Amino acid sequence: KFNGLTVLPPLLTDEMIAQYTSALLAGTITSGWTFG
Amino acid sequence: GVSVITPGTNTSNQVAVLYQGVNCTEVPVYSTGSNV
Ligand SMILES: *[C@@H]1O[C@H](CO)[C@@H](O[C@@H]2O[C@H](CO)[C@@H](O)[C@H](O)[C@H]2NC(C)=O)[C@H](O)[C@H]1NC(C)=O
Numbered sequence: 001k002f003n004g005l006t007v008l009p010p011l012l013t014d015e016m017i018a019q020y021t022s023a024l025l026a027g028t029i030t031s032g033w034t035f036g
Numbered sequence: 037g038v039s040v041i042t043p044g045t046n047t048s049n050q051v052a053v054l055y056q057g058v059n060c061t062e063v064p065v066y067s068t069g070s071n072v
């Protein structure tokens with residue numbers, strides 16, 4: 001992949017996004033619209 | 037590529053160097069000795 005150009009890595013890895021989604025989903029299960 | 041991280045000119049004059057897309061076995065005051 002080394003030809004004169006590079007690919008930068010993403011700032012947030014997959015576990016980060018998974019944990020955000022789990023937090024949002026647990027919040028909407030328990031609280032509802034209040035936590036917004 | 038090489039990037040520099042600095043906390044600001046007004047506060048200090050110390051920077052941290054980040055070498056992108058390289059494995060630390062051929063990198064060579066910033067050569068060795070310091071924290072890698
Ligand atoms: C950077 O290079 C070193 C040395 O080539 C890599 O160390 C190897 O690590 C693997 C996995 O533990 C071992 O099977 C090899 O035997 C190691 N090499 C030697 C020469 O002992 C290291 O993994 C490299 N780093 C990256 C991020 O690729």
Ligand SMILES: *[C@@H]1O[C@H](CO)[C@@H](O)[C@H](O)[C@H]1NC(C)=O
Nearest residue numbers: 042043044045046047048049
């Ligand atoms: C230097 O800049 C920083 C910006 O984060 C500021 O917080 C700090 O007060 C500044 N100090 C001086 C001496 O200007």
